[PDB]
Subunit: 40 residues, 3 copies
């Protein structure tokens, strides 16, 4: 079931974002691949 | 055009995150596939 | 290293979400492909 994200971080060294979930012990994450770049 | 996200949720049963957008009737979403796991 | 997201936007014309990062000059983004649709 959908749960809220408590903290969203991204990492320019791994090109991933990590969403910490409000669930369980607080250490469940959703993590996905991203592009990372310097925009205008 | 880019619009703000009003609520971000993720679901460990579907392995997707859903971003509710500030747009229209409030029921437009961006939805993407993710990994979901228990981190350190 | 992971840094906080300061602003999350999505765009129904490009089918991408963009996360502005707390890093550098504020113009670093993570950007990823998404589905965009009108949910129930």
């Amino acid at each position: 079931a959908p749960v809220p994200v408590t903290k969203l971080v991204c990492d320019g060294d791994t090109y991933k974002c990590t969403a910490y979930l409000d669930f369980g012990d607080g250490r469940w994450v959703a993590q996905w691949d991203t592009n990372v770049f310097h925009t205008g």
